[PDB]
Design a protein around this ligand. Structure first.
Ligand SMILES: CCC1(COc2ccc(-c3csc(-c4ccccc4C(=O)O)n3)cn2)CC1
Ligand SMILES: CCC1(COc2ccc(-c3csc(-c4ccccc4C(=O)O)n3)cn2)CC1
Ligand SMILES: Nc1ncnc2c1ncn2[C@@H]1O[C@H](COP(=O)(O)OP(=O)(O)O)[C@@H](O)[C@H]1O
Ligand SMILES: Nc1ncnc2c1ncn2[C@@H]1O[C@H](COP(=O)(O)OP(=O)(O)O)[C@@H](O)[C@H]1O
Ligand SMILES: [Mg+2]
Ligand SMILES: [Mg+2]
Lengths: 326, 326
């Protein structure tokens, strides 16, 4: 690329808007909170993009040369250009034009991860470091989550969604968000297998607290698709009589724990170390190998964890932990 | 100590009798299997003792000087002397005299761990390495388990216990051994709290396989005492209505998994890193701090693991894994 403008922002450090600082925006009888947030987003978005362009520049030359990798690298450069070229936000007209660019760039970059994984897969013969692919995809996925959180938050500040301040839900019920995806995952499972296991939810079912549901909107359907597929493939002779998937909610002052326990035979000993690798699968629902590593990258980025406990021959317990807001 | 006889056996490596090699002893119409095993035990017992005397010699001087530590060190030296002084086993008379010495030495050393922990506790002010105490107690406990397995196996070869070849049960049912300790632990819990949680056992309830129950005879009552105490202390207002402790058996070709799931509020975040430390407790049943670290040292020595999964505010799932025989 050899661009000096990008070099300037690759070294300047990132600024993360804390959940409490995000909530401290509600100047309704003025609209001054809208401009304050947009002025931050305008400055922060190119820094995040440049930090990732730096990652593409640090890829070994032979890999960075792949036409698909180069295309995604080019996309990140043009995105940085489009964002920095925009003049500073002064009024409601300057804020509105930025929101349109952000929405277009959020749609132009929707398939970056799929192109990146393909480019990296195509380059397997030249990849010497086994961790290279995992660390590059982990960092790309978490950078995008960070960007998508800031961008979606500012765009949602224009909506008057009940119980929400942008992307922060002030009254989130973990039981309701689980229920929302349980019915969705059962429909996908029913389509493939003719049936789906019934889901039972116990624990702190009435817990309510402020939280950002965005990461849970990815993790929960992925973990439910895994638990349901496994339960069906291990009860092939009785597809009509499959054991329930039991979800437990544990809410304490430190974190939120969601445990998903299935009776799907568990993860085999030989596969136990490969399940967290990108592309690894034993099979859209399945046939991807992204659900587990992406969900862990997500949980860890947000101060939590994704831990698996396999009981080979019986089932698996998946523990999703996420740190509380503030 | 400065004893040259012990120096000779501290360097000679250990020989471990594999489960299949132990089972290959049943020369009933001769009694030749009895002498072959005793001739091994006579040679192996001083090597194990010397390897541990070497550990006492490697303790920092200030700690090894503690009167309690010195007493246990002296006990190990006198044990090595008594065993090596015995003349080689040639007939049924020479085998019988060794069995009496082994039974006496197994009774003389019954309180070694309690004296050792006390001596180490007394020396806390001089202990600089935090891992020193954990590693010394882990190595002492596993050495003793190894010795107790060999000694008890040979002594049990004289018994005609059904479904057993010394200490190996040919038809072990994990459900039955769990049941055996469940009623025992409930009696101890009832004595302290006025009630105990009912225990539910599911999974591979009818699994049967060859196995050494000795380590399970320690781990299961300890893990059940922990799950029951926790369930009672978290349901103080309703001691009469406490949630069940649910045990799941998973039997596959690689290992045996026993999961103990309680609804006892879980292990607090602040205590989560200290629970595996010797002496750490939040309180004979309780007030010891040995149950968890000893059980893990045991599981790992036998090619398995002891893993804890805390759901703070709800309960804890404890996963005991043990590698299969052969
Ligand atoms: C060049 C900077 C831009 C584009 O930033 C992004 C960030 C995230 C996404 C996005 C769309 S769908 C999505 C996703 C969802 C679930 C799980 C994984 C992903 C993922 O693909 O990362 N993220 C798109 N553009 C602000 C203009
Ligand atoms: C000097 C070598 C000897 C003595 O060897 C041992 C080994 C083990 C034990 C023993 C008794 S009770 C026991 C225990 C049970 C459950 C959990 C922990 C322990 C423990 O104290 O290690 N182990 C005693 N003497 C063969 C003559
Ligand atoms: N609950 C589970 N029980 C059994 N196997 C599982 C479970 N969750 C995941 N797996 C295994 O891990 C593999 C990778 O999972 P994942 O990353 O979600 O991708 P996918 O399911 O789309 O292939 C799966 O193909 C499956 O073999
Ligand atoms: N199932 C459990 N639920 C909650 N706390 C537990 C559980 N198991 C162990 N603990 C905690 O770990 C501490 C140490 O346990 P352990 O080593 O068994 O010793 P003890 O229970 O005799 O004190 C206990 O004092 C208790 O605070
Ligand atoms: Mg998946
Ligand atoms: Mg205990």
């Amino acid at each position: 690329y050899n661009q000096s403008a990008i070099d300037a922002a690759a070294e300047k450090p990132s600024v993360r808007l804390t959940p409490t600082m995000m909530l401290y925006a509600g100047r309704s009888q003025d609209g001054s909170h809208l401009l304050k947030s947009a002025r931050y987003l305008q400055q922060e978005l190119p820094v995040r993009i440049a930090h990732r362009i730096k990652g593409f520049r640090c890829l070994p030359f032979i890999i960075g040369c792949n036409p698909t990798i180069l295309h995604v690298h080019e996309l990140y450069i043009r995105a940085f250009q489009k964002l920095t070229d925009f003049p500073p936000i002064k009024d409601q007209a300057d804020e509105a034009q930025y929101c349109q660019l952000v929405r277009q760039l959020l749609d132009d970059h929707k398939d970056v991860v799929t192109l990146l994984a393909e480019g990296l897969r195509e380059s397997r013969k030249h990849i010497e470091d086994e961790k290279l692919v995992r660390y590059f995809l982990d960092k790309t996925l978490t950078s995008r989550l960070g960007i998508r959180m800031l961008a979606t938050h500012h765009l949602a500040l224009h909506e008057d969604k009940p119980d929400f301040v942008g992307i922060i839900c002030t009254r989130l019920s973990p039981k309701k968000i689980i229920e929302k995806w349980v019915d969705f995952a059962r429909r996908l499972c029913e389509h493939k297998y003719g049936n789906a296991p019934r889901v039972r939810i116990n624990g702190h079912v009435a817990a309510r607290f402020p939280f950002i549901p965005m990461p849970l909107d990815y993790i929960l359907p992925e973990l439910l698709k895994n638990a349901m597929r496994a339960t069906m493939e291990s009860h092939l002779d009785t597809p009509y009589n499959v054991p329930d998937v039991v979800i437990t909610i544990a809410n304490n002052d430190v974190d939120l724990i969601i445990r998903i326990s299935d009776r799907g035979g568990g993860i085999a000993h030989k596969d136990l170390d490969r399940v967290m690798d990108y592309h690894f699968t034993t099979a859209p629902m399945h046939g991807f190998g992204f659900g587990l590593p992406t969900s862990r990258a997500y949980a860890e980025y947000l101060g939590g964890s994704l831990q698996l406990q396999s009981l080979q021959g019986i089932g698996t317990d998946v523990y999703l932990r996420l740190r509380h807001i503030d």
